[PDB]
Design a protein around this ligand. Structure first.
Ligand SMILES: *[C@@H]1O[C@H](CO)[C@@H](O[C@@H]2O[C@H](CO)[C@@H](O)[C@H](O)[C@H]2NC(C)=O)[C@H](O)[C@H]1NC(C)=O
Length: 1008
């Protein structure tokens, strides 16, 4: 008996080229044992002549071509199945073009080979149990090597009797046993199926060694609408993109789910191909069989049997994958890994979750419940179960998060809620923006995408302003969300090439400037845009020009800082944001918690009511004039004021004819007066009290395209509707906070004002533009002063407190403490003090070899107390081989300094002042080349001007040594607040600066 266990990845191989089979008669016998539904038992020959016998989804297939039109048979499972693990028999006989296939010896089928050929000629190879590629050999219906046991295999023809089961065992120099081996039976088989529990979970796979041809099959099961199943790329091509030379192009293929839809992706070196693998959505939570067969340019993709044609563009046949292939998602931060833009799910971090079994690569079963399964993958499990409890009953999403019933898990969509995290349990961080702050995520490498999900929540009082924006250093491409006249406006600009579009936009929402929070969600899939504010109905648009790919280097909020190529941009935001989410990154939170280091900003975290760049008008009569209001089609004004005065003109701008617009305070109440060609109207803003109670008020005044005017004061809307009128430009400059003295005597009809505004304006928004009231003024009158808090503090005789130097800044004075021996903002706190006690000590600063200073002017100050008569406090030496040094010492109870910059030594000594005394003294030394000066405490400055040839550079400074041990005169007392050319040497030492060594008896003091 000749029985042999076919391991799966093993097969027999006979060489017929020394004695060709070619025959008119012939006959084929064997018994088979298999659990599996497909597998090649055997095959011989190439082109037009072959004979091919194998199990095809549970039935015995047989193909014969004698040279001109095959005979195909597929004998059926009558009473039970063939994949039963029991023995079954095959007899195949053939007389000329006549074929009979017998099963177990009684399930016959008869037919003919086509046309007139009768000669089966094959001089290549005779395969048993599998092959180098099964989906290739001619007439194959399967693509699978055999798993299980084969018995008593024989091909008798009229001439020779190739008895293959026997010749393989007894050993023949014409029989090649390619891979594995195994020669008994009663040996069983099967391989486990697998569950990928989490998105991020993935299995790493052995290189698909494709080429011209390759095939793949596996089974899947899930209720997850989106996810990346299989993916693999080649090596980076020298053939660049025209538009994106920055974008790494590679050969590849992927299989992917996207909204329950199955998808195949191939790129072989010229253009991609996307294929709906099946019409119906496949996230049925039902098993599906997936064959993928490819042959150079063409191939088919098969779902439960239903095959779909493809041909990839261009003439590239080879699909050149190299190295690792991936199943169920991608790793994070594998360098070398390149995500091609065409593959949506890779770039949206939708790793697959669900079940996968029975994997075959080029015909060969790879078992997975081992793969990197027993090889330490996290979030993958042995068997595959479907938890009948619907997990969103678990009731798991907090705070009105939306719950999605997943695979074996629920998912939360926290986007609209102010929370994040698996269960919306984490409060989401708020960034707050006052019109001159930004928060900019600089991606660590450059993104290229064809598809996004972006959401964010904002609130603002302003009808305009940027929400979020992606930007490139290399072009003006951008995906951007912004407030535009109260609506949210999505803009998707993709830029040029071809020449010898416009922007594409959506709008959603109205009046979102109410200072309540709104959620905005953008989905892009290629040319499709979908935008949607809050719960309202989604607004959709198809983009038109056939570019889809978007390059970005940053995601920007607040200010658009990267705008090299735009001479103009949406205006800076003022309000708050929260829950920025961009292909699932929560950048605001990541940034705040420091989970990412590439986030850069000057927004402030946490919410606060904003007053944005407040400006003071000191006297009524002070006013500025700005360039003309630009209310084209609609108008949205906003500002805040704070005043103690009952009446003044606040905003005036006039037009052609009787046209004008005014905003004024009258007897405490706010009045918006205007005439747009139908005569003057007054609308009184609504409040019970006078508004000059020295608090900030918000004022918001707007005319829309229906001519509905609205005046809002703090929380109170007043609306009125006025006459339909060709809306016309204004003409005069735009005056704020008064007008020229002479003008009030002739302002329009119902304008009360005879005097300007006194008080503060802030957050001034003129129909989309945030002027800097002081800086953008065209001219000015009287005093407009920055801030809302009177003037900056200015320097006084007594301002700094230890001979600190008082310097003026724009926001009040500072004290330069450098030459005092002190610290703190008024030079009044003790400088960093070290106590040098008995037996000596030493703090050394050592410059790193290349930052060795070489100066023409030095200055050094330090504070000290000591009883000593002889001591070296501090010394600075040049590096090994040069003369130059500077040394502050106490010789004969008197403080002094000695230095050499390449000529003579120069001494300078405070001769008269007691300093070894026990009391605190400070000494300040300066030097300019040859000349130097010395001063202690309050003693007149001592100046030294050498005559003759002085060199001037203290060359290559290498160490500052404090303490005296080197120069053998240890210091003993207290050294405090030493400053040398910019270095605060003791602050440095008290902070473990790596270039500081401390040795010996020397202690850092406490503070108060
Ligand atoms: C060292 O000190 C002297 C003395 O004041 C400086 O020499 C004078 O420089 C001034 C301009 O500041 C000239 O008008 C004089 O002609 C110079 N007088 C002398 C005595 O030469 C000198 O420049 C200082 N040198 C350095 C390098 O700081």
């Amino acid at each position: 008996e000749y029985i042999a266990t076919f391991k799966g990845s093993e097969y027999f191989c006979y060489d017929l080229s020394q004695n060709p089979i070619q025959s008119s008669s012939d006959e084929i016998t064997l018994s088979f044992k298999t659990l599996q539904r497909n597998g090649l038992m055997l095959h011989t020959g190439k082109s037009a002549d072959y004979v091919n016998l194998a199990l095809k989804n549970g039935a015995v297939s047989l193909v014969i071509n004698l040279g001109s039109g095959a005979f195909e048979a597929l004998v059926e499972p009558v009473n039970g199945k063939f994949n039963d693990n029991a023995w079954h028999d095959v007899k195949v006989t053939r007389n000329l073009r006549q074929v009979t296939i017998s099963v177990d010896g009684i399930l016959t089928t008869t037919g003919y080979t086509q046309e007139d050929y009768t000669m089966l000629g094959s001089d290549d190879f005779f395969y048993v149990g599998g092959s180098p590629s099964t989906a290739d050999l001619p007439g194959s219906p399967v693509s699978n090597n055999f798993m299980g046991c084969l018995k008593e295999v024989v091909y008798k023809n009229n001439d020779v009797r190739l008895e293959l089961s026997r010749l393989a065992k007894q050993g023949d120099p014409k029989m090649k046993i390619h891979g594995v081996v195994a020669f008994k039976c009663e040996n069983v088989a099967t391989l486990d199926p697998i569950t990928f529990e989490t998105p991020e979970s993935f299995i790493s796979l052995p290189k698909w060694n494709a080429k011209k041809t390759g095939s793949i099959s596996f089974d899947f099961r899930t209720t997850e609408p989106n996810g990346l199943i299989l993916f693999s790329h080649g090596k980076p091509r020298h053939q660049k993109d025209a538009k994106h030379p920055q974008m790494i192009k590679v050969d590849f293929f992927a299989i992917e789910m996207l909204d329950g839809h199955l998808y195949l992706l191939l790129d072989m070196g010229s253009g991609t191909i996307k294929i709906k693998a099946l019409q119906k959505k496949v996230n049925d939570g039902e098993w599906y069989h997936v064959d993928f067969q490819r042959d150079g340019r063409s191939g088919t993709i098969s779902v439960n049997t239903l095959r779909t044609p493809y041909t990839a563009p261009g003439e590239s046949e080879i699909l050149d994958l190299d190295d690792e292939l991936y199943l169920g998602g991608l790793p994070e931060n594998k360098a070398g890994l390149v995500f091609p833009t065409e593959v949506w799910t890779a770039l949206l971090n939708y790793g697959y979750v669900g079940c996968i079994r029975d994997l075959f690569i080029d015909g060969q079963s790879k078992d997975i419940r081992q793969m990197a399964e027993v090889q330490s993958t996290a979030g993958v499990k042995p068997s595959c179960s479907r938890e009948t409890a619907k997990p969103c009953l678990s009731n798991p999403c907090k705070n009105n998060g939306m719950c999605r019933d997943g695979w074996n898990r629920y998912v939360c969509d926290c986007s609209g809620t102010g929370y994040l995290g698996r269960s919306c349990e984490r409060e989401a961080t708020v960034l707050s923006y006052d019109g001159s702050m930004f928060m900019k995520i600089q991606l660590p490498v450059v993104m290229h995408t064809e598809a996004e999900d972006v959401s964010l929540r904002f609130r603002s009082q302003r009808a305009y302003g940027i929400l979020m924006a992606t930007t490139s250093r290399d072009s003006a491409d951008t995906l951007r969300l912004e407030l535009d006249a109260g609506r949210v406006k999505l803009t998707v600009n993709l830029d040029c090439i071809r020449i010898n579009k416009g922007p594409e936009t959506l709008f959603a929402g109205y009046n979102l400037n109410d200072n309540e929070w709104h959620t905005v969600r953008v989905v892009r899939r290629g040319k499709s845009l979908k935008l949607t504010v809050d719960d309202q109905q989604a607004m959709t648009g198809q983009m038109a020009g056939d570019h889809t790919r978007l390059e970005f280097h940053n995601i920007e909020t607040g200010i658009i800082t990267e705008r090299r190529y735009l001479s103009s941009v949406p205006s800076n935001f003022i309000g708050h944001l929260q829950s920025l989410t961009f292909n699932g990154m929560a950048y605001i939170d990541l940034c705040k918690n420091g989970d990412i280091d590439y986030c850069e900003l000057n927004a402030r975290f946490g919410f606060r009511n904003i007053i944005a760049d407040p400006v003071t008008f000191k006297t009524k009569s002070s006013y500025v004039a700005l360039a003309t209001l630009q209310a084209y089609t609609s108008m949205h004004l906003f500002f805040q004021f704070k005043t103690t005065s009952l009446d003044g003109l606040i905003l005036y701008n006039s037009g052609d004819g009787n046209d004008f617009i005014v905003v004024e305070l009258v007897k405490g109440y706010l009045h918006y007066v205007f005439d747009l060609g139908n005569g003057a109207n007054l609308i009184k803003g609504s409040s019970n009290k006078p508004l000059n109670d020295n608090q900030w008020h918000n004022v918001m005044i707007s005319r829309d395209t229906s001519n509905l005017h609205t005046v809002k004061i703090d929380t109170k809307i007043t609306t009125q509707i006025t006459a339909g009128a060709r809306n016309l430009d204004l003409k005069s400059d735009l005056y704020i906070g008064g007008v020229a003295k002479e003008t009030y005597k002739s302002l329009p009809k119902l304008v009360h004002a005879k005097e300007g505004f006194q008080g503060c304006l802030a957050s001034v928004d003129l129909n989309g533009r945030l002027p800097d009231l002081i800086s953008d003024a065209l001219f000015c009158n009287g005093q407009i002063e920055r801030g809302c808090e009177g003037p900056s503090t200015t320097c006084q005789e007594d301002s700094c407190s230890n001979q600190g130097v008082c310097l003026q800044q724009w926001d009040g004075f500072s004290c330069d403490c450098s030459m005092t021996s002190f610290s703190g903002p008024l030079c009044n706190d003790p400088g960093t003090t070290y106590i040098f006690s008995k037996g000596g000590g030493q703090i050394t600063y050592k410059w790193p070899p290349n930052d060795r200073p070489s100066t023409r002017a030095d200055r050094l100050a330090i504070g000290f107390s000591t009883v000593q008569k002889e001591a070296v406090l501090v010394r600075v030496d040049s590096s090994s081989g040069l003369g130059d040094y500077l040394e502050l010492h106490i010789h004969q109870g008197k403080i002094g300094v000695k230095f050499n910059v390449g000529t003579d030594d120069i001494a300078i000594e405070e001769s008269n002042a007691i300093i070894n005394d026990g009391k605190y003294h400070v000494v300040r030394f300066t030097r300019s080349g040859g000349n130097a000066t010395l001063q202690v405490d309050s003693w007149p400055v001592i100046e030294r001007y050498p005559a003759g040839r002085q060199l001037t550079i203290f060359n290559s400074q290498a160490t500052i040594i404090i303490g005296g041990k080197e120069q053998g005169q240890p210091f003993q007392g207290q050294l405090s607040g030493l400053y040398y050319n910019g270095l605060k040497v003791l602050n440095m030492a008290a902070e473990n600066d790596a270039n500081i060594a401390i040795v010996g008896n020397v202690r850092l003091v406490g503070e108060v």
